[PDB]
């Protein structure tokens, strides 16, 4: 049974700085500077900041565009899943990714989603019904405060998820932390559907916040250290100084 849970507030913005870099492929490299072209969140971009405070719970339907950078900071594990699709109703196949205490369930079905879907661990009040599914996958859960970052890409039918989890110190401004951390590949799902919109699923029973950015086709120079770990990167289309650094292959 769908339950209609509000006012609409204007968005906040935060400074992305140097974040959103992920390993472009599954190839070991070390002690080398590698130039690659792929979809990355632009350096020093403007990222949309949403709030979950409890009396406001931001969970709007957002565009997916060409890929989404998603991040959240919390302790109570309020953000537990995502919905990806087009019309997000019984007319088309949609992707539902939901985490719980023991596992993660990923399935693609013609879901009739609720006007304001959520989880309620007294159970799913995400959809009222579902028809014939095309994809099923079950594995281990994907999910000082916990900083969780994800990259969602949809290329040639493959829904690629990258992720990173680090502990962060609490700062009063409650902004994005500075520093460099690369995202490792998590899962690659052979689904084959058209994602144009997505929505964040919140679990009810605290405070949390999340950020949304969009990826662009850009050229990056990635620095691999002795242990094949990416420790730095240059956005070759940010400014004239970065352009020179990329040309000369030097940080």
């Amino acid at each position, epitope marked *: 049974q769908c339950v209609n849970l509000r006012t609409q507030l204007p968005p906040a913005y935060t400074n992305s700085f140097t974040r959103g870099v992920y390993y472009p492929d599954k190839v070991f490299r070390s002690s080398v500077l590698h130039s690659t072209q792929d979809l990355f969140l632009p350096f020093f971009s403007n990222v949309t900041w949403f709030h979950v405070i409890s009396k406001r719970f931001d969970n709007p*339907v957002l*565009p997916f*565009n060409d890929g989404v950078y998603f991040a959240s900071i919390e302790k109570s594990n309020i953000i537990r899943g995502w919905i990806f699709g087009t*019309t997000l109703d019984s*007319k088309t196949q949609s992707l539902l990714i939901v985490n719980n205490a023991t596992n993660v369930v990923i399935k693609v079905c013609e879901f009739q989603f609720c006007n304001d879907p959520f989880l309620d661990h007294k159970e799913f009040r995400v959809y009222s019904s579902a028809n014939n599914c095309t994809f099923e996958y079950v594995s281990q859960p994907f999910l000082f405060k916990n900083l969780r970052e994800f990259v969602f890409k949809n290329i040639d039918g493959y829904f690629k998820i990258y992720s990173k989890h680090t502990p962060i110190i609490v700062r009063e401004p409650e902004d994005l932390p500075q520093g460099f951390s690369a995202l490792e590949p998590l899962v690659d799902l052979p689904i084959g559907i058209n994602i*144009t919109r997505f929505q964040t699923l919140l679990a009810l029973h605290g405070a949390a916040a999340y950020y949304v950015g969009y990826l662009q086709p850009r050229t990056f120079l990635l620095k691999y250290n002795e242990n094949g770990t990416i420790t730095d990167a240059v956005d070759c289309a940010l400014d004239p100084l970065s352009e020179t650094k990329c040309t000369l292959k030097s940080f």
Partner: antibody
Amino acid sequence: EVQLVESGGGVVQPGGSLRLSCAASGFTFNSYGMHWVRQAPGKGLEWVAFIRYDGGNKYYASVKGRFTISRDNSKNTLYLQMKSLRAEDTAVYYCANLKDSRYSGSYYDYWGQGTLVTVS
Amino acid sequence: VIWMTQSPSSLSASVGDRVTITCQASQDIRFYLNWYQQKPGKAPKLLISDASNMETGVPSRFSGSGSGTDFTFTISSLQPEDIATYYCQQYDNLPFTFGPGTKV
């Protein structure tokens, strides 16, 4: 509140040019695509142009080759540059964010007030 | 380019009457049709999306249905506040197009 404000209208001569602009606020302008739609007195709605969120791909209607669509995401401003204007282009020009599950992905439908452009 | 047409171009109805407007597309656009209502001097307002989905805040007296090329917009009981020009718009592919408009 979400508000789209057109400006730059007025009266021009045939063969001349005019640059219109739309100021956006109250929403994440830089993540959405935008459309231009015009309506001449006595007529229905006519679609003119569309630009993607990244200011990359551009599409045009009757106007292709004469009108140029562009945007600046640092100013939250949408622009339409009209060259070689004709008498038939007299209309009220609106900027809009049209609900679209296939291309822009917008889940919300927004319209401005419109600005009048007269060619004579 | 997809052609859009509507019928009748104008209709006369009283308060309490049932009003139906037909939209037809020259090409199959599945379920990607928007319905707009425009009052004189105002920008168009969206009432129905994806053929049959109602927008939030739209009165229950409004409805619509259809798929492919033939779509219908219905007012179950016309109100004095429902006097406007109704337009259908397709967004299956670019360029997007609007119909002629129906005068109620």
